[PDB]
Symmetry: D3
């Protein structure tokens, strides 16, 4: 007996102020958070249908540790396209995740957020190359316009599913 | 790329007047058809979620032939619990399906319809034994009360999934 | 920020064979279970809308009390509301309701626990517990009574939704 | 520009105690009301899909037991005429509810469905065939319902919407 | 007995041509109206889920009066970010609403529409200060791109809910 | 007896690389495909509600030929706003459709895709005039941002419905 929808534990990581919370609140509440209130730790749930399968996303929004990294099945690694340092930090978030999961192949999506802003310092091609080198998808997002937001979370679920088979 | 929901081709068979159409219309329109208008052939579609999977049911409602039996992925074999003859006919519907599919193991559910009526002539235990001998589920239904209607169709989808 | 739907932890209790599992599987899978496979402990989830509010039901399906357990009290202590199920053709299951209710009051350490009384198997002709008797019992406890059939689906949604409504009243 | 779903104004009428409220609450809340609390006037809304069309049912639940009566009957687009299958008198009253509706709508052809409620109860006094003949003589559908078991409940309301749609074409 | 979903009566006001109709049609039909057909009065309904609660939005789309303002529970005050005059008019729409509701505290959201256009004449900071002075939310929208559209309406519903408690 | 939702057979046509596949996958999977994998032929289904009517979209995604054009009830004619040649080709796609349907009045929507790109070579007004000359709607889309994607498909369904009455 099927006992209820499949649950997926997703974790959003990345440097302070890249828009991890804004992405998540946009997904859950269809609301853009304009204020910058730094996060300690928040969790959110949403039921969605992805590729014809109903599921429950349990999303942990982190601060810019080993316990959440151990329980998470997939990770959104978020940088801001106008902050080169946030992009350089991605490497370290990814190594930390691989270390705590004790694995080379953890479901992950690279997210370049704030793509609505004119002040771009990270080229799409650079981020795409970085993602290709990790063998993971790259998505450009804006929590403000909602560009790529659903896609980033759904793509992560699809990565988790590929990794379970 | 997933191209849209899974489709299941379901066929409802059994003797004239057992309630094949009424079952189907109850599923699709939430409507009990009181009149008896014999069917030639009708098809119906419905999108439902079963065990967390979205699917598109394509349901062929038959008359009390080889082409529909060949394209169908699963069969509801319907008799009426107040008509012993309709129950005896099940064996023949099942052989015909096995012959046309050239298969011993075709997804199938045995459906005893009109369970709301007081004139029962087929015992549940007899129908359960028949179903057990075929290795298929048995469900009692009423197109009038809606008892078992969803369950019969959803169980058939689950049988199709096991067989894939 | 609202962080996602409200969750309600429901526990289904009552004597062995009254239809606790059948009720739950009928809710979750729209399927009537004809076989009797005794439960140790099983849990289920379902998202529903009740009174315009989306919620997530976490349902714990328990065993008939046969004997002592410290593990029993722990799982029962997680419930916010309880369906107390008897079978309308089994007078003993109805008499046991009192003991299920005392067990719940003891483990929740409370006199006022959201609860619904469920008389299952109402499709059967062999009725031994009258509707009026069960209604009077429920009235004496100050809780709703619902007659159900896991087979026909009569009252099944209503029993679970009514329990959610009781939980909501108790939170306000 | 389509401006949002189609709205249908439905009115439930019939003798005191036939189950008008219980039918409506069963539709709206999936809840059977066991108590008998007489209604003055209540309205309820529900969005449903019927034959692939999304609509908003605005349902007026009336009293069995008078300027207010004419107003609801005038705004209503379709009527469920409910009797209880164990109460012959409620069945005899149906004719008069139908005439009252025709009078208040000032029309001979009002979308209507005949509903025989309490079909779960053993003490049936109105035969199905009698009710079917009455409905046939009016040219309207007949549905047997139980607010307790939910038998026919959706069907009664959906069938009324289908009647309203036929009457608008 | 709960009688069906909660209903919210919303009114969209603001100067001629700011995009009141376009916002509303985008919400209801997922359609961008490119033509400018001036409105007399139109009403629209939509059922949505906001913060886990199902509700029925009844939306009155107004022309560039006391009766609609009296029955409305919340107001979207819309200006266009490329039209300074529409922004200056907001003050008058707000005073008119306060006068007709006989209230200092009416649920309201300030909407800066046409944020897809390059020809911006109202600074975000100015609009944010105006909204802060009124104690109401500010949202930038585009009926064309759909940026902020759901958020503007849902935020107004959230304001109405806060005001009912 | 209504036998289940209305089905609409939609065909997406236009020059190689304009984003026909990306538009369709964005509609079906909420996913932007960044790679360019040329299509031979693919079909997709989706149930949606448009103007209160539930329907089943059967969408044929074509390559940059008589059989699909004969079974299709409506056509999205897609060009890319940074590719003038794709825009000039529209005329020929439209003639090919009229020829195979043997009809002067085939439901059709003109779609200007890639409207997120800065390298615009086709003016919106030119495309609108072309659409006006055909008596069909014009919609600007981005498969990347999702701007106009639902609108393009829904508008085509509305065109199909007008043509059936
Ligand atoms: N323009 C624009 N602003 C954004 C975007 N995402 C976030 N912001 C803004 O960036 C600021 C920081 O956003 P926030 O979500 O708090 O970032 P964070 O990554 O969660 N910070 P922390 O790790 O401290 O919790 C906010 O003021 C927010 O409005 C975006 O996509 N576009
Ligand atoms: N009481 C009751 N009557 C039923 C039920 N199912 C069907 N009927 C009645 O049985 C009669 C025949 O039903 P119908 O659906 O036409 O049966 P069918 O198998 O499709 N006949 P055919 O093979 O001629 O198409 C109808 O008068 C119908 O109302 C049921 O479950 N209970
Ligand atoms: N006729 C009828 N039979 C039912 C109903 N509900 C349950 N049953 C039957 O009663 C038997 C016991 O049901 P089950 O759900 O396993 O009972 P349970 O309370 O979970 N037993 P346990 O406490 O051992 O887990 C099964 O054969 C089942 O089909 C009902 O409403 N009607
Ligand atoms: N068994 C059974 N009882 C029903 C059904 N419908 C209503 N009842 C019961 O009959 C009584 C009357 O129901 P109610 O819905 O209040 O009737 P009404 O037509 O709305 N009365 P009024 O006209 O005074 O508002 C209640 O006790 C109710 O539980 C039904 O289908 N079955
Ligand atoms: N670029 C862009 N154009 C817009 C936007 N919103 C509206 N428009 C355009 O602005 C014009 C006026 O829009 P309309 O919705 O009719 O505005 P309105 O406030 O309802 N006018 P009125 O008060 O006369 O009824 C239309 O041409 C429309 O396409 C937007 O967000 N972006
Ligand atoms: N920036 C942007 N790129 C897009 C958009 N739509 C498609 N593309 C890009 O353009 C390329 C071609 O898209 P694709 O859908 O394969 O084009 P097509 O019309 O189906 N090509 P074919 O006819 O060979 O099948 C891909 O690289 C894709 O990412 C869009 O709206 N914006
Ligand atoms: N629902 C509360 C829990 C808290 O901890 C969580 C940890 C992870 Cl990795 C994901 C979701 C979570 O949700
Ligand atoms: N949708 C039209 C088709 C026609 O033929 C069908 C064949 C089967 Cl087995 C099932 C459903 C069918 O429906
Ligand atoms: N007279 C016919 C009998 C009974 O019913 C039958 C049904 C089928 Cl599908 C085939 C053979 C049969 O044999
Ligand atoms: N003698 C009857 C027994 C007493 O103890 C019981 C305890 C429970 Cl929780 C339930 C039923 C019981 O039945
Ligand atoms: N929704 C407010 C209305 C007012 O009066 C009503 C009249 C009818 Cl026929 C139906 C529903 C009603 O409720
Ligand atoms: N549903 C029709 C009504 C007409 O008048 C309205 C008045 C307001 Cl404030 C809001 C919505 C409206 O819509
Ligand atoms: N700015 C000059 C006018 C003054 O009066 C106004 C009143 C309203 Cl409600 C709207 C716009 C107005 O603008
Ligand atoms: N169901 C598969 C079909 C194949 O041919 C199709 C033709 C059209 Cl115009 C649309 C969708 C199609 O999908
Ligand atoms: N640019 C001229 C070519 C000619 O042949 C074509 C055929 C089609 Cl279906 C569309 C565009 C074409 O473009
Ligand atoms: Mg944060
Ligand atoms: Mg038939
Ligand atoms: Mg059990
Ligand atoms: Mg009443
Ligand atoms: Mg307007
Ligand atoms: Mg392609």
């Amino acid at each position: 007996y099927f006992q209820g929808m499949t649950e997926y534990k997703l974790v959003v990581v990345g440097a302070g102020g890249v828009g991890k919370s804004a992405l998540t609140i946009q997904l859950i509440q269809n609301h853009f958070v304009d204020e910058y209130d730094p996060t300690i730790e928040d969790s959110y749930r949403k039921q969605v249908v992805i590729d014809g399968e109903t599921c429950l996303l349990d999303i942990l929004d982190t601060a810019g540790r080993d316990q959440y990294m151990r329980t998470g099945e997939g990770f959104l690694c978020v940088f801001a396209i106008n902050n080169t340092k946030s992009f350089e930090d991605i490497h370290h978030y990814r190594e930390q995740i691989k270390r705590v999961k004790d694995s080379e192949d953890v479901p992950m999506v690279l997210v370049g957020n704030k793509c609505d802003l004119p002040s771009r310092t990270v080229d799409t091609k650079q981020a795409q190359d970085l993602a290709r080198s990790y063998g993971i998808p790259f998505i450009e997002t804006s929590a403000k316009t909602r560009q790529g937001v659903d896609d980033a979370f759904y793509t992560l679920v699809r990565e988790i599913r590929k990794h379970k088979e």
